[PDB]
A paper describes a structure:
The Nectria TAm belongs to the fold-type IV class of PLP-dependent enzymes and is built up of two domains of α/β type. The active site is formed by residues from both the N-terminal and the PLP binding domains of one subunit of the Nectria TAm and the N-terminal domain from the adjacent subunit. Thus the relative positioning of the small restrictive pocket and the large pocket gives the enzyme its (R)-enantioselectivity towards ω-amines.
In order to analyse the active site binding pockets adjacent to the cofactor the Nectria TAm was co-crystallized with the inhibitor gabaculine, which forms the mCPP adduct with PLP in the enzyme active site. The complex then undergoes a number of bond rearrangements to form an unstable intermediate, which is spontaneously converted to m-carboxyphenylpyridoxamine phosphate (mCPP). The mCPP adduct is positioned centrally in the active site in close proximity (< 4.5 Å) to the S pocket outlined by the side chains of residues Phe113, Val60 and Glu115 but does not fit into it. On the opposite side of the active site the L pocket outlined by residues Tyr58, Leu181, Trp183 and His53 from the adjacent subunit forms a much larger cavity which can bind the phenyl group of substrates such as (R)-MBA. The formation of the mCPP adduct causes the rotation of the PLP pyridine ring by ˜ 35° in relation to its position in the holoenzyme structure; the positions of the PLP phosphate and pyridine nitrogen remain fixed. The carboxyl group of the mCPP adduct is disordered due to its clash with Phe113, which is also partially displaced to a different, strained conformer not observed in the native Nectria TAm structure. The rmsd of Cα positions between the mCPP complex structure and the native structure over all residues is only 0.21 Å. To explain this enantioselectivity of the Nectria TAm the mCPP complex was used as a template to manually position the (R)-MBA-PLP external aldimine adduct in the active site for catalysis.
Residue numbers in the entry:
A (entry chain A), B (entry chain A), C (entry chain A), D (entry chain A): 1 to 322
The structure:
């Protein structure tokens, strides 16, 4: 489909239904040790190393209009992250997918955030032999879709800053391609953005290149060509979809080092994430990005990204059995 | 007191009593939302941001022979960490101390690990206003004292490596003076040490200086003078005690940049932490440190550190009301 | 003495004399292999490794009103730099000083820049044994005093930027306490400043701290206290003099890490260098520093720094034998 | 042609002729301000900013058996380097090539090192307007071919270390794709290698990846595939030739991040540079690389690289007019 008005109008209709629901799972549901629990009642062991040392990876696919979006790509990224961390998925994929679809169906949520967390488990790495660290724990939950930029704001764009008081954790400390919850730097960025009268922090690599922000990748558009950092960042599924969309809409996209100066020269800027989709930035460091309006290439990408949510290649329909 | 044999003999006697205990709190006790729970049964909310984004600081004081060691120094460090993170202790100090002493007394544990965790709470920073982030959560627990180096090994020293596949998260990403559970780099170090046939990883700053390791600070001893990194590291309470001990035993200690080459030139090497105390390193990168035996200055520090546990200035006695 | 008007008026009088001189050495004189040459005619061997690989250290003391300022401090810093580089001064100190004073006297220059360069010599390090690298070369020259900020501008202050396209070479690559001519980053900073409509670049360490700029150290003044970076920078003789001046004028000065945010919060900012002295900064990133006027503590330091040029403790008089 | 014995035998014959030459240019010739001078007599102005602030780029093509090797690739790299530095070639390309060929012919040198240096000139960047910095200086010289690894050693391989006391200057300080003479870190590496009983330092990026060394790129060979760092390094013409050679000999080569651990796992290691060609490394950190012998893929590359020196696509013949 894909115009802003159409995509958001459908969401608003579905949200109206969900907000009126008497289902105790309408606010979300968690899977904890084989049992489904309302999300706000869910609890995990204090001694889980996902809490004790954030010793975990995670991933967040999504459901849009009752259709899982690029689920296999998320599951493959999670499996790759687990392998890099010497973790292993505690359930085989068919059981993971059956469980997730059951949770979503039970909740009635049509536009959902769908998180999976794999932790080291109850035995810490420090002082253990490798064979003592194989009993890894899985937590999964769904909740209503979350917006890093609200729909109304996507029409006019948001306010970003290039963070100056913090830089991204370097890959030689923590590999940013391993999706993780060690957000110390990203939280510093969020506070700095708020202190500076903005919402979205763009972090550098401490070597004068752009990386990513607090829950999103960044794409610059300059003289008809798209640019996004290669290193120092999560290889986002939304970013992958932007690369797909650029090729399909017929634009060049370059995944390479992006010197931070390029941010100040950009014709258009957008953020991309599962938690909100395609999120234009129209003010940077208190100055407008070009004319301060959402750009034409941004809009082409926006439309294509959303159109993909109803295509077989990128999505599948959940049966809500209602 | 302070000889290895004496200190460890007392611990073994107290451990023998604890291991025979029928008290359901002998394996530890947690405080969760005002209620005491056996440690292995304790659970926290899934949505706590201490789990969802490791958005927390913590601290770990200890009890030795029924005496809290440097509790105020730990509580002041935790309060300073909270302030740096824009967190606040959810209970006033008198209530914190009363609760901790009650937990320890109830458990009967004489040699204890005593952890306090302050998290952002149930509302995430991303998308919040600062005034929405003030309802911070506190978790506290005690467990039997944990050894990063077992007593028997402290007689002969351990095996370390200088990590080559990972470096410490830089302070411009996460301030290492804020004690935290974002251990991605330290866990990489632990796996690298195990892969290389060692136990203790020393991480560099990625600029050819020594920092700290996975749960400890590092001190080098060279030509009668002690050296420990100033930047890039937690300002350990054990390290503070080593500085106190050095001054009292009459040695110079220098808290300054320590180029990594110094590790290879050291006369003695020790690690220091609340979880084990003073832990000699006698093999580095598969080669002996000097003669490969625990050094004389290390032993002087070891003895003084433990002697401090029975001095008023540094400790207070808990009434177990038994 | 020390008011701006008085100090600059004396310089202008002496400059008027020098500008009228018919002495062929009035524009400067070089010492090359034991011979004095007019500066603009001086030549060095192409194969000198100071040119072939910038394999050198240098230092620049100065003469003010016919008085060498802190010459021994410069010579001791040069000797320390040589030792760090495994170079050695090719002439003993008495011969160095006799030669420099003779050059200055011969030139008639009363306000002089006085440079010494020690290079590896004609044999490169690559492919040599250490004993083949001991024949180091010395070049010395004097020229009329050079202003990084012109006298008239010192009344109102200059325009700085925090560089965003470059960061300072880290000490684990090149030790910035070794004064050196490998200015690749500082030249990038200069071009960035010019591109951004400013004159003075302040470089960060790539970890969100202030370092130094292109030929100067940086001092911030905040709530009556002075602050200057400890690491990542040359330990300037002017900076040393500012520390002396602060203590004498009775202010606290802290030589420690300076987060870059502090630059944006400063009450006053100044740059310091032998090539110009004490140089106020009153615009930063296109915004005024406080009221955009030269601050009171800056002026106290300015006056004291210049007063030192006529004190025995810090200077000696050259006999021009005229 | 291309076997070691054949290639080196031809060089030895030509060297025998050159060593007997009575030509005053047989030891090299420099071009300085339009005049040819014997290399050991050549001198440059002291005030040239190539000396005063190493404010220059350079390049070093070569002549082998009287044939210039990949001259245009070197000249294009030099032109790109100049553009990045806001320098410009002071002579048009036809004059550069005519001059270089004349110098080589006059010298009689058949196997030559051929250096070009472009400096900022006599006006320093600091304190200048951009339009005052356009009078750039050119120096060119030829000298007999220089070996970073002597021919006899290439049969058995050399000794390398991974540097631990220094790391490569990061690209956000100085762009390593701009060939430059600011060798502070590389000289530290050379001294560290010598201190550790080795000849060749491999520097990391300070983030646990391999970069390059003191005058060479590094290629690892693992399970039939070649690997060489993408970032942090000069894009060597020899490296380009190795990429060409790998494709022609039919091997995969990957130009990507190379974690430093890979060096310790490699089947074969080689260094590559114009100053010596293809230089096997058979000892790393005092341990043999696999069997400690020169590997089969290294030999295939070695042969192909040298074969290219007699092919039209990659070389042209100089007329010595003898
Ligand atoms: C650091 C970072 N970088 C990039 C992205 C975008 O990645 P995807 O295009 O694959 O979503 C993210 C997004 N991470 C993310 C996505 C959806 C939900 C949540 C949540 O837990 O609130 C987090 C992120 O956290
Ligand atoms: C990174 C790091 N650095 C230094 C220390 C030593 O700090 P103290 O001297 O203040 O203890 C630590 C120690 N951190 C620590 C101490 C005691 C117990 C536990 C645990 O949770 O297992 C962790 C640490 O984790
Ligand atoms: C990088 C850097 N940092 C600090 C200073 C100030 O140091 P002193 O306070 O010791 O001068 C410098 C100054 N370096 C300097 C000083 C005087 C003349 C020249 C020249 O060669 O033009 C260079 C410098 O080049
Ligand atoms: C840092 C660095 N990296 C890689 C190379 C290899 O680049 P080429 O494959 O393009 O040559 C170099 C080599 N640089 C080089 C090459 C030839 C001679 C000289 C000299 O001046 O002694 C220096 C170098 O100095």
């Amino acid at each position: 489909m894909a115009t802003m008005d159409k995509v958001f109008a459908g969401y608003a209709e579905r949200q109206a239904v969900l907000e009126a629901s008497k289902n105790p799972l309408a606010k979300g549901v968690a899977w904890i040790q084989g049992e489904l629990v309302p999300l706000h009642e869910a609890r995990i062991p204090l001694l889980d190393q996902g809490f004790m040392h954030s010793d975990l990876t995670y991933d967040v696919p999504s459901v849009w209009d009752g259709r899982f979006f690029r689920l296999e790509d998320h599951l493959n990224r999670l499996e790759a992250s687990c392998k890099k961390m010497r973790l292993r998925m505690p359930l085989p994929r068919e059981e993971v997918i059956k469980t997730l679809v059951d949770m979503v169906a039970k909740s009635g949520i049509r536009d959902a955030f769908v998180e999976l967390i794999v932790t080291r488990g109850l035995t810490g790495v420090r002082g253990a032999k490798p064979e003592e660290l194989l009993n890894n724990n899985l937590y999964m939950f769904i909740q209503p879709y979350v917006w890093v930029m609200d729909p109304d704001v996507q029409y006019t764009g948001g306010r970003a800053i290039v963070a100056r008081t913090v830089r991204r954790v370097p890959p030689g400390s923590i590999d940013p391609t391993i999706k993780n919850l060690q957000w110390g730097d990203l939280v510093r960025g969020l506070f700095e953005a708020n202190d500076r009268g903005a919402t979205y922090p763009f972090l550098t690599d401490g070597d004068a290149n752009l990386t990513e922000g607090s829950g999103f990748n960044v794409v610059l558009i300059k003289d008809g060509v798209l640019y996004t950092p290669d290193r120092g960042v999560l290889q986002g599924i939304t970013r992958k979809s932007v690369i797909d969309a650029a090729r399909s809409c017929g634009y060049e996209i370059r995944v390479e080092h992006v010197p931070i100066e390029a941010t100040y020269q950009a014709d258009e800027i957008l953020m991309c994430t599962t938690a909100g989709g395609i999120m234009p930035i129209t003010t940077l460091d208190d100055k407008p990005v070009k004319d301060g309006k959402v750009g034409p290439i941004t809009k082409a990408i926006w439309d294509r990204y959303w159109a993909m949510h109803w295509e077989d290649e990128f999505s599948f329909k959940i049966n809500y059995l209602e």
